Structure formats: structure tokens, C-alpha cells
């Protein structure tokens, strides 16, 4: 170890783990100005999840967390009057969860409010 030695009986280096140094083109990083990951244009993947024969939950993946979480979903319940929520899926990462098959309303919402982009319109009905 040879780390911190100023305690009576603890020593927990884990206490100093706040994700330090996580950005540096000249240190732990690599990006090609010409070589890009893939031509995806960062679309907005929808995807529906109908547990039963109606318990649908249209989700939205790709959207930026910077968006107005409130005006984002809250507005949904004001336009279509549907049940919308915000979930941070581990398989996708930060994805809204609408109630019922909104694959046609959400994409319409993303464009109606200006959330996603017509080019990002990635609707994938289960």
C-alpha cells in the first residue's frame, strides 16, 4: 500500500475516488479528427415496452440530460395528456419513460417541442 498513514485504524483509499482526471487528449484519451466512431448522427432511439396487452412504456434514448427534464416530460402530459417519467436505464443511460405506445407521439413530441432532431428520429416499436 504505502498510501495514507495518519489514522488509528481505518485506511480507506476508496474514500478518495471521485473520478479524478477523466479528460486529457494528451493523457488517457484518443480521438481522430477524420476517423469517427460511426455515421449515426447521434439519433434518438425510442423503443416501446408493453408488459401486458396494453401496459406500454415508450422510452426515449439519446436525449441530452441537459434538456429541461421538467418541460421535457411535463410538457408531454400537457400535449397528449399521457403519463411520462424520467428513468436512468443502465443499458442505455438516461432515458425518459412514457406511458402507452407513444412511438408515434414521442417522435412527434421531440419535434413539436424541439427536443430531438428529425434526423435523429429513431423509432423502434418493440
Amino acid at each position: 500500500m504505502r498510501g495514507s498513514h495518519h489514522h488509528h485504524h481505518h485506511t480507506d483509499p476508496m474514500s478518495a475516488i471521485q473520478n479524478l482526471h477523466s479528460f486529457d487528449p494528451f493523457a488517457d484519451a484518443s480521438k481522430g479528427d477524420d476517423l469517427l466512431p460511426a455515421g449515426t448522427e447521434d439519433y434518438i432511439h425510442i423503443r416501446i415496452q408493453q408488459r401486458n396487452g396494453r401496459k406500454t412504456l415508450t422510452t426515449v434514448q439519446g436525449i441530452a440530460d441537459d434538456y429541461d427534464k421538467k418541460k421535457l416530460v411535463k410538457a408531454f402530459k400537457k400535449k397528449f395528456a399521457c403519463n411520462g417519467t424520467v428513468i436512468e436505464h443502465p443499458e442505455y443511460g438516461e432515458v425518459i419513460q412514457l406511458q402507452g405506445d407513444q412511438r408515434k407521439n414521442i417522435c412527434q413530441f421531440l419535434v413539436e417541442i424541439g427536443l430531438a432532431k428529425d434526423d435523429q428520429l429513431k423509432v423502434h416499436g418493440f
Side-chain angles (χ1 to χ4, degrees), residues 39-98:
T40 40
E41 250 246 329
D42 224 35
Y43 302 153
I44 301 313
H45 241 82
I46 299 289
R47 220 96 148 180
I48 273 179
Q49 61 213 97
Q50 228 166 15
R51 242 135 132 164
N52 217 51
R54 50 215 226 78
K55 205 59 54 54
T56 346
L57 256 164
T58 305
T59 19
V60 185
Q61 354 199 145
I63 294 319
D65 187 27
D66 214 20
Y67 288 16
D68 287 16
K69 221 181 296 208
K70 257 104 176 161
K71 242 185 142 72
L72 202 180
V73 70
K74 202 212 213 266
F76 207 84
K77 307 125 135 149
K78 210 98 220 297
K79 180 159 180 69
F80 326 83
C82 269
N83 272 128
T85 134
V86 63
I87 58 174
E88 208 198 340
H89 214 255
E91 253 273 10
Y92 326 139
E94 207 259 304
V95 302
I96 276 270
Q97 228 206 355
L98 301 152

